[PDB]
Design a protein around this ligand. Structure first.
Ligand SMILES: [Mg+2]
Ligand SMILES: [Mg+2]
Ligand SMILES: [Mg+2]
Ligand SMILES: [Mg+2]
Ligand SMILES: [Mg+2]
Ligand SMILES: [Mg+2]
Ligand SMILES: [Mg+2]
Ligand SMILES: [Mg+2]
Ligand SMILES: [Mg+2]
Ligand SMILES: [Mg+2]
Ligand SMILES: [Mg+2]
Ligand SMILES: [Mg+2]
Ligand SMILES: [Mg+2]
Ligand SMILES: [Mg+2]
Ligand SMILES: [Mg+2]
Ligand SMILES: [Mg+2]
Ligand SMILES: [Mg+2]
Ligand SMILES: [Mg+2]
Ligand SMILES: [Mg+2]
Ligand SMILES: [Mg+2]
Ligand SMILES: [Mg+2]
Ligand SMILES: [Mg+2]
Ligand SMILES: [Mg+2]
Ligand SMILES: [Mg+2]
Ligand SMILES: [Mg+2]
Ligand SMILES: [Mg+2]
Ligand SMILES: [Mg+2]
Ligand SMILES: [Mg+2]
Ligand SMILES: [Mg+2]
Ligand SMILES: [Mg+2]
Ligand SMILES: [Mg+2]
Ligand SMILES: [Mg+2]
Ligand SMILES: [Mg+2]
Ligand SMILES: [Mg+2]
Ligand SMILES: [Mg+2]
Ligand SMILES: [Mg+2]
Ligand SMILES: [Mg+2]
Ligand SMILES: [Mg+2]
Ligand SMILES: [Mg+2]
Ligand SMILES: [Mg+2]
Ligand SMILES: [Mg+2]
Ligand SMILES: [Mg+2]
Ligand SMILES: [Mg+2]
Ligand SMILES: [Mg+2]
Ligand SMILES: [Mg+2]
Ligand SMILES: [Mg+2]
Ligand SMILES: [Mg+2]
Ligand SMILES: [Mg+2]
Ligand SMILES: [Mg+2]
Ligand SMILES: [Mg+2]
Ligand SMILES: [Mg+2]
Ligand SMILES: [Mg+2]
Ligand SMILES: [Mg+2]
Ligand SMILES: [Mg+2]
Ligand SMILES: [Mg+2]
Ligand SMILES: [Mg+2]
Ligand SMILES: [Mg+2]
Ligand SMILES: [Mg+2]
Ligand SMILES: [Mg+2]
Ligand SMILES: [Mg+2]
Ligand SMILES: [Mg+2]
Ligand SMILES: [Mg+2]
Ligand SMILES: [Mg+2]
Ligand SMILES: [Mg+2]
Ligand SMILES: [Mg+2]
Ligand SMILES: [Mg+2]
Ligand SMILES: [Mg+2]
Ligand SMILES: [Mg+2]
Ligand SMILES: [Mg+2]
Ligand SMILES: [Mg+2]
Ligand SMILES: [Mg+2]
Lengths: 53, 148, 222, 51, 156, 185
RNA sequence: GCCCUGAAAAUGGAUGGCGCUCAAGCGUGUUACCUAUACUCUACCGUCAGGGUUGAUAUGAUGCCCUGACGAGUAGGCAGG
RNA sequence: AAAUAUGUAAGAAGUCCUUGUUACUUAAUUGAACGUGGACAUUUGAAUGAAGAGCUUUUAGUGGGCCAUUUUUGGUAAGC
RNA sequence: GGAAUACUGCCAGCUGGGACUGAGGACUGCGACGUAAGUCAAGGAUGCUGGCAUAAUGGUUAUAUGCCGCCCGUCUUGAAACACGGACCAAGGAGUCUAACGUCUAUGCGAGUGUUUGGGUGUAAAACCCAUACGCGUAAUGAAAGUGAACGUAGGUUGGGGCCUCGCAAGAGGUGCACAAUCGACCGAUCCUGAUGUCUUCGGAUGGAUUUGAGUAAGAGCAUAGCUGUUGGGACCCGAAAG
RNA sequence: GAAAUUGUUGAAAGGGAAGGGCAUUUGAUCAGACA
């Protein structure tokens, strides 16, 4: 990570900064739009008691 | 004085600061140096290694005096001349007329070499010297004169 | 010696100058907030229109209230409650949600109530029970100069600036949020709504993530 | 020497936050949102009332 | 000495008061209190007496009268919180009242003017009362709570 | 309740006055807390505290330890300050001029310093000549040269010297101190 | 599922007692309400901490002044009285 | 082959360039260890917290314990 | 097709009833309202009115009433215990003094320190003065005979308050006592090496070694006094069977 | 000339102990402050 951190620091500086190279935790998810096309929702229900044996 | 003392402060409490359970009793671990090799050994080794057993030769009827021989280091040495006179000898450091210091007269038995005297010449009268003390004393143009 | 008015001149004009900056800044935020809400609303509406589902971003900010007293508490959750600054019953703090704090929240679910706070309740938390930490010494917010003196360095030179850094989880949420002494809340005024507090919200108890239902609780407590 | 709640106490309400005056002037707390009439795709309704 | 002697005494200088911020503003009365309105007195010398309300004096009190010739109560001050305001009104539009204020009752038997003022105010009121049957009788009978009466229910 | 994270009602641990009853000490302290409250010079803050220190925490500084310090590069014209007493040392023969400000100078110490045409100054005189401690070199003495600390940390393999009254062969030098007698330490 | 049988011990006797039967019982749901030395705000005591203040010509510089937080306790320690 | 528990790491005591010292070590100025000189500052290297952190001396009482959830041995069992 | 309503949420929308508090004591802040003059609810209550001026309010006390409240002391895991002591009251009644000590602190002096065995002197067990010794300290290490502390600016490295220099500042560099860590040098012991030499077996220079010391490396001690702690003493007080 | 303990006088309470806590009624008693 060090050896890499040096690089993107060079790649920034030389260019004209804006780096940000601390690690960060998993962030929560952003919004998103899920389409229904090819994928209408399947409705499930709970299933009755049964024995097999 | 009694007035500043914790026992004035313990008045009214039951156990005088000695505890209710353990109590204050006469001689719990035994008296004095009891227990040394048994229930007090951990304390004795640690804090007092060396304590039990013997080393070395007995000497019957030893007379300290026989071995009286105080040390003085070059360190000092010029201290054995009073200051008024000291400066007179420090400057005009020479043969022909160099100070005689009688280190036995001052009550020393051996001259040792802790460190650095000025280049001034001294005539040093003593019973014993350490090889270094003499070397150093000489490199300033002095001598040791062995007395008794 | 002038100063009489002569340096009361600088001061009053400069103070006047600041309220101006605060005035336009608070106008900005209110536009920022209300188009922020409207967009999400038209998001959902557009997505239905297209035959689709707009799934909101997951919440980035939670607000945690310690619901449990100080006795008989296992070590691991005890430490976490300390680090989240919840060391007495009914006090609360804000928390930026990342994987590394989720797991904190998880370890303390039986002792806390938390959820996603609305603008209204972050605003009324801070206007009412908001206190800075200043050379320790818990100091009430009450004047904007108190804020600018300790958070100015980060932009943030007023009370609604503070709120804004909180609710939008800004680049300086850590300094901003730590600045706020943990909030000391009362017991809920109309009560807890449940017979027994110490089971999960989902089982008719009070502890855990109750999501947006936190606003009703915290308002009743504030 | 006495913490005064804004929220109740217009004096310090306005001392903190000067937007309060125009906020209330223009009502703003009761903003009328633009009436728009977009309608949901059949798909959405169908699966809403699906068993 | 018997006792020693402190090494520090309080100064005996008394501080000025801080500059307090407490404007007196006018007491606005509850809507039911409108001159011409009949009041039930709830306490006092004339407790239970039904009486006509005339003016809101500068010390917040209410100027009322019996009228004296009806029920025995004179032009008089009464406190607005020891009064039940009924819903029945006599018009009070020919009753002078300008004269009557706090100093008029500066404590300082009965002065000929009070005696006289009482009659000038009452003849006008009596003129108006006659316009509604039984009102005089109403005004001359005391109010009292009867078995079963529940003030928090009753309309007055 | 509060789940306290740290001891309550804890005193800071630091002296705040000296334990001494000496008026003149208390006067110097009157002086230096003033200087410390009103000058933002760090020298004054350091000096204030040293005035509070107990005798152990202010070992004597010898006049030869002073001569050394003046041998630092660029330090010869500095005025050395010692918040304690200053002692003499016949082990140095040639002692420089300078100005030493201290709490006490032994007879032989002020002699040596004065014989070289230097100057002994009290701390208040120092205050007046240097309200911000300008051009000043503070020296402290050896604290851990004390005989007491010889014995701190006594225990196996620690090498720290017995609390012992008589010494000689035959005092605490056998079982436990040599390989041939039980074991060694 | 509830109820009933299966169900035997010693002074008279215990859903805490009275008593209760579409309960004042059992299962479940919804409101309201009562009240801890706990929580919120405030005053006052003390403890710890951080500030301010030698400028005389009046009285405590270990003083005075501002501010914040905190307070269970046997054995035991220390402190001020 | 889990879950819970558990070792280490997340930088200035860091990273890179140049090339000095030795009796060690290499076929070898090869290496190894310690260095000189030079280049890059706080998004300098995750989170949260921090009524600060480190350190020294000395000394009291104590050294019969018992209980609850969970794991769990002996015992038919036990308020064992 | 077009509305209404419920539900949930928001308003820096308005407004009524009730309760508790009113700390502070000139001014000083941040504001609000006004064209202004001024005003204000803006860094902690004022205005107006009445009653009494006294046992009225308040304190104390006895009793009554609501609710609550088991004998203390002790040892104990656990005591109100069907564990022990204690009928009652006065008065007595238990960590002390001494020898020698550890740590801490105050004070005097400081490479020293300590007048009080003794002498001198006296307003006579005091106070005042003092010569020679002695004790501890200023050297260590060896069983001992013995030997005995600078390669060097009394060393290098890293951190280091403070000071110094530059800079408006932030910062940069210089110096760095104490203290800490680390690598060396010095003295003794142990082991090895064994020069110039010699009453030919004495002598032991010199350079070394995963060895070793309560050491050196520009001294810190000595004395008096106090709290706490240590050992010997009847040893906090009272108690055997015994010898 | 204390206390334990006792006689008389005066006042009060007392349905198988007494004594105690928070609060107020009632009786008795009393300081202060008003001007
Ligand atoms: Mg003693
Ligand atoms: Mg005494
Ligand atoms: Mg005492
Ligand atoms: Mg005590
Ligand atoms: Mg105590
Ligand atoms: Mg006591
Ligand atoms: Mg105790
Ligand atoms: Mg004790
Ligand atoms: Mg006992
Ligand atoms: Mg022995
Ligand atoms: Mg020496
Ligand atoms: Mg539980
Ligand atoms: Mg957080
Ligand atoms: Mg409510
Ligand atoms: Mg309600
Ligand atoms: Mg309620
Ligand atoms: Mg329940
Ligand atoms: Mg509330
Ligand atoms: Mg349907
Ligand atoms: Mg005003
Ligand atoms: Mg009004
Ligand atoms: Mg009539
Ligand atoms: Mg030494
Ligand atoms: Mg039953
Ligand atoms: Mg029941
Ligand atoms: Mg039920
Ligand atoms: Mg109901
Ligand atoms: Mg309370
Ligand atoms: Mg409080
Ligand atoms: Mg306590
Ligand atoms: Mg772990
Ligand atoms: Mg761990
Ligand atoms: Mg923090
Ligand atoms: Mg801090
Ligand atoms: Mg201990
Ligand atoms: Mg112990
Ligand atoms: Mg022990
Ligand atoms: Mg035991
Ligand atoms: Mg438990
Ligand atoms: Mg007041
Ligand atoms: Mg006041
Ligand atoms: Mg009276
Ligand atoms: Mg009366
Ligand atoms: Mg009586
Ligand atoms: Mg009871
Ligand atoms: Mg017992
Ligand atoms: Mg038992
Ligand atoms: Mg008991
Ligand atoms: Mg029993
Ligand atoms: Mg017994
Ligand atoms: Mg008995
Ligand atoms: Mg007695
Ligand atoms: Mg004399
Ligand atoms: Mg005599
Ligand atoms: Mg003689
Ligand atoms: Mg020897
Ligand atoms: Mg030999
Ligand atoms: Mg090195
Ligand atoms: Mg530097
Ligand atoms: Mg350097
Ligand atoms: Mg050696
Ligand atoms: Mg050896
Ligand atoms: Mg020794
Ligand atoms: Mg020694
Ligand atoms: Mg003893
Ligand atoms: Mg016997
Ligand atoms: Mg016998
Ligand atoms: Mg025998
Ligand atoms: Mg008699
Ligand atoms: Mg009583
Ligand atoms: Mg009472």
């Amino acid at each position: 990570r060090v050896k890499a951190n040096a690089a993107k620091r060079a790649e920034a500086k030389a260019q004209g900064v804006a780096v940000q190279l601390k690690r960060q935790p998993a962030q929560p998810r952003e919004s998103r739009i899920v389409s229904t096309e090819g994928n209408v929702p399947q409705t499930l229900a709970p299933v009755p008691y049964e024995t097999f044996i | 004085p009694s007035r500043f003392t914790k026992t004035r402060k313990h008045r009214g409490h039951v156990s005088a600061g000695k505890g209710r359970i353990g109590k204050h009793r006469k001689h719990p671990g035994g008296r004095g140096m009891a227990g040394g090799q048994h229930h007090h050994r951990i304390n004795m080794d640690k804090y007092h290694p060396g304590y039990f057993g013997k080393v070395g030769m007995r000497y019957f009827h030893k007379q300290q005096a026989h071995f009286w021989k105080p040390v003085l280091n070059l360190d000092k040495l010029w201290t054995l001349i009073p200051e008024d006179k000291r400066d007179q000898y420090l400057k005009s450091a020479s043969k022909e007329t160099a100070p005689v210091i009688d280190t036995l007269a001052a009550g020393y038995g051996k001259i040792l070499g802790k460190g650095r005297i000025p280049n001034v010449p001294v005539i040093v009268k003593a019973r014993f010297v350490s090889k270094l003390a003499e070397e150093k004393i000489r490199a300033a143009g002095g001598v040791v004169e062995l007395i008794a | 010696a002038e100063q009489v008015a002569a340096e009361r001149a600088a001061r009053k004009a400069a103070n006047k100058e600041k309220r101006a900056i605060i005035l336009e800044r608070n106008a900005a935020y209110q536009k920022e907030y209300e188009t922020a809400e409207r967009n999400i609303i038209q998001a959902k509406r557009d997505a239905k229109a297209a035959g689709s589902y707009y799934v909101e971003a997951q919440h980035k900010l939670v607000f945690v209230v310690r619901i449990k007293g100080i006795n008989k508490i296992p070590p691991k959750p005890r430490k976490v409650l300390q680090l989240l600054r919840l060391t007495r019953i009914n006090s609360g703090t804000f928390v930026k949600v990342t994987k590394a704090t989720l797991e904190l929240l998880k370890l303390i679910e039986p002792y806390v109530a938390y959820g996603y706070p609305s603008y209204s309740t972050i605003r009324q938390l801070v206007y009412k029970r908001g206190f800075g930490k200043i050379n320790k010494q818990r100091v009430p917010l009450s004047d904007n100069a108190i804020i600018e003196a300790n958070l100015g360095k980060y932009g943030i030179l007023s009370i609604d600036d503070l709120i804004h850094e909180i609710i939008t989880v800004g680049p300086h949420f850590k300094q901003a949020n730590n600045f706020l002494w943990p909030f000391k809340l009362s017991n809920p005024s109309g009560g807890w709504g449940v017979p027994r507090k110490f089971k999960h919200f989902i089982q008719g108890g009070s502890f855990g993530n109750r999501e947006e239902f936190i606003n009703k609780l915290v308002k009743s407590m504030n | 020497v006495l913490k005064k709640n804004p929220l109740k106490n217009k004096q310090v309400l306005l001392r903190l936050n000067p937007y309060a005056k125009v906020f209330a002037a223009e009502k703003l707390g009761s903003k009328k949102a633009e009436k728009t009439g977009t309608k949901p795709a059949a798909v959405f309704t169908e699966t809403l009332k699906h068993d | 000495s018997a006792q020693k002697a402190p090494k520090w005494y309080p100064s005996e200088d008394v501080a000025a008061l801080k500059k307090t911020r407490k404007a007196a503003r006018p007491q606005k009365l509850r809507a039911s209190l409108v001159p011409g309105t009949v009041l039930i007195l709830l306490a006092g010398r004339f407790r239970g007496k039904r009486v006509v309300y005339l003016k809101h004096l500068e010390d917040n009190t209410l100027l009322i009268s019996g009228p004296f010739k009806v029920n025995g109560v004179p032009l008089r001050r009464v406190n607005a919180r020891y009064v039940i305001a009924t819903s029945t009104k006599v018009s009070v539009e020919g009753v002078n009242v300008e004269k009557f204020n706090v100093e008029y009752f500066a404590k300082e038997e009965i002065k000929a003017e009070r005696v006289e003022d009482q009659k000038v105010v009452d003849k006008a009121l009596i003129a108006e009362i006659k316009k509604t049957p039984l009102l005089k009788q109403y005004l001359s009978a005391s109010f009292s709570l009867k078995n079963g009466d529940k003030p928090h229910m009753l309309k007055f | 309740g509060i789940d306290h994270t740290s001891k309550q009602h804890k005193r800071s641990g630091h002296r705040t006055a000296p334990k001494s009853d000496n008026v003149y000490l208390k006067l110097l302290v009157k002086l230096y807390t003033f200087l410390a409250r009103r000058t933002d010079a760090p020298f004054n803050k350091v000096v204030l505290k040293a005035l509070f220190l107990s005798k152990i925490n202010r070992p004597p500084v010898s006049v030869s330890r002073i001569a050394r310090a003046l041998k630092q590069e660029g330090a010869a014209n500095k005025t050395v300050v010692v918040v304690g007493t200053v002692t003499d040392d016949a082990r140095i023969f040639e002692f420089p001029k300078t100005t030493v400000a201290a709490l006490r100078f032994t007879a032989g110490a002020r002699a040596k310093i004065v014989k070289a045409g230097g100057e002994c100054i009290t701390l208040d005189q120092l205050a007046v000549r240097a309200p911000k401690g300008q051009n000043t070199l503070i020296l402290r003495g050896p604290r851990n040269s004390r005989e007491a600390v010889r014995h701190f940390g006594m225990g196996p393999h620690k090498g720290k010297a017995p609390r012992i009254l008589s010494t000689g062969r035959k005092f605490e030098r056998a079982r436990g101190r040599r390989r041939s007698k039980g074991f060694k330490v």
